[PDB]
Amino acid sequence: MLKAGVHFGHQTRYWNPKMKPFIFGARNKVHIINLEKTVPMFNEALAELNKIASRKGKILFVGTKRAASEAVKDAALSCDQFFVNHRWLGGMLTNWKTVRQSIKRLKDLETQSQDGTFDKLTKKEALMRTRELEKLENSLGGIKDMGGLPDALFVIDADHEHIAIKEANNLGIPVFAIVDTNSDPDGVDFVIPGNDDAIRAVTLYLGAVAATVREGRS
RNA sequence: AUGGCUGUCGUCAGCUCGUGUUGUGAAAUGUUGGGUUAAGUCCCGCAACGAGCGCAACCCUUAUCCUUUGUUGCCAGCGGU
C-alpha cells in the first residue's frame, strides 16, 4: 500500500493551525506534511470507503479546481460512480429536490437532442437549447444518473470545496477529504493530509481511491 | 363602508415566490459582481438552484414580391369609336 511518491506537502501561505498535528514543516518557508502520518490516515480512508463501496453505495467525487478535471471524471467514470468536476452548485445535496428537476431537464433535453425533435421549427432556439445542454451537462454532469443523494462524499480540496463539505456534514454523509496545510478539518470524517493541487498527487491519489471503489463483492 | 370601470407614477423596468443556505432576529441571498442591452435583455461568475408576473415574441397596420378571383374596379396590347 506504500509507494515512494512525489508530493511531500505544500502551501507556505495561509497555513491553518488545526493542521499542526500533520506537519513536518521545514523547507524554504513551505510546509511539509508528515506523510508517515498520511499513510495510516489514507489506508483508513480506503478501509471505510471500500466498506461502504461494497455495500453498493454511491460515492460522488468532487473535483472543481484544475486539473482535478478530467481526473475526477476519469477516476469516477473508471468506476460506475459519480462526480462533480465544474462549479459545484450551492445546494445540490441539501436541496437536491430542485436539483432533481434540473437533472430531469438534462435527461429530457438530451433525449430530445440526439434522437427526437432537435432540427424542428427553429435554428436559433435549437442553438439556444443545445448550449443549455452544454451548461446543464458540465454543471450536472456526473450526478445526472445518481437518482439518490449519495452514501459518501470524496472531495479533493477541503478549503476550495468547503460548500460541499458543509452540506454533507449538514446531511450526515461521510466526507473523505485530502486536506492541505491551508485547509481545515471541518467535519471531514476521514481526513487525509496530502497535496490538493499537484496533478501527479491527485492522479496517484484518485487512482488509489478508484482502485478500491471498484472492488464490491463482485 | 363597496363592486365594476378609470386616471397616475409609467410602457418606468421592475415586483415577487418555492426549496436551500446565512443571521438570535427584523431580514439577507437569489435579484449583487465583470461586460452588454431598448429591457433583472443576454453571456460569464457566484450559496444558490429554480419559478411566476412584467420585458421580448405571438396581434392589427404600414413598407416589397408571388399565387388566386376579376365586378361596380383597371385599360398594356387589340378593332372601330
Side-chain angles (χ1 to χ4, degrees), chain A residues 7 26 38 48 87 89 118 127 164 167-169 176 178 199 204:
Chain A
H7 68 266
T38 300
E48 274 82 5
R87 180 183 83 90
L89 301 176
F118 60 97
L127 183 63
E167 303 190 4
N169 294 324
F176 294 85
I178 168 167
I199 58 206
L204 181 136

Side-chain angles (χ1 to χ4, degrees), chain A residues 64-84:
Chain A
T64 300
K65 67 199 284 184
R66 298 167 289 105
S69 307
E70 65 161 25
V72 299
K73 181 163 64 77
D74 194 0
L77 210 54
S78 66
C79 298
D80 295 328
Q81 294 299 323
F82 308 103
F83 60 96
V84 175

Side-chain angles (χ1 to χ4, degrees), chain A residues 15-162:
Chain A
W15 81 281
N16 194 355
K18 296 172 72 55
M19 283 286 111
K20 193 181 229 305
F22 299 136
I23 281 171
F24 192 82
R27 301 173 178 83
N28 290 112
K29 288 202 159 59
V30 81
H31 282 279
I32 287 95
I33 58 97
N34 188 5
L35 48 93
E36 298 302 322
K37 196 71 176 308
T38 300
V39 173
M41 292 283 157
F42 185 58
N43 290 319
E44 285 291 325
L46 264 62
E48 274 82 5
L49 190 143
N50 195 5
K51 183 190 181 53
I52 52 94
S54 177
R55 195 203 302 284
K56 203 67 174 77
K58 300 186 291 298
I59 189 73
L60 212 166
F61 292 86
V62 177
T64 300
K65 67 199 284 184
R66 298 167 289 105
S69 307
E70 65 161 25
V72 299
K73 181 163 64 77
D74 194 0
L77 210 54
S78 66
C79 298
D80 295 328
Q81 294 299 323
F82 308 103
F83 60 96
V84 175
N85 55 0
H86 295 90
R87 180 183 83 90
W88 198 81
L89 301 176
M92 64 174 67
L93 293 183
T94 171
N95 60 341
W96 184 62
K97 178 186 157 201
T98 305
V99 173
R100 281 177 73 256
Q101 66 251 17
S102 298
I103 288 168
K104 186 180 195 180
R105 183 164 177 81
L106 181 60
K107 289 205 211 156
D108 295 334
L109 264 69
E110 67 178 2
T111 303
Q112 188 177 5
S113 180
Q114 77 253 5
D115 184 75
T117 62
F118 60 97
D119 196 74
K120 182 69 174 201
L121 290 172
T122 314
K123 301 293 152 164
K124 190 162 197 172
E125 188 180 21
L127 183 63
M128 191 75 67
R129 177 166 293 173
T130 51
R131 64 184 174 78
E132 288 185 350
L133 270 86
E134 267 97 14
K135 182 174 151 61
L136 295 173
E137 187 67 31
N138 66 2
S139 65
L140 297 169
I143 202 168
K144 71 178 181 191
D145 291 334
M146 181 176 282
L149 52 89
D151 297 332
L153 184 73
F154 185 84
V155 301
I156 207 171
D157 195 2
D159 62 346
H160 186 271
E161 287 300 314
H162 61 278

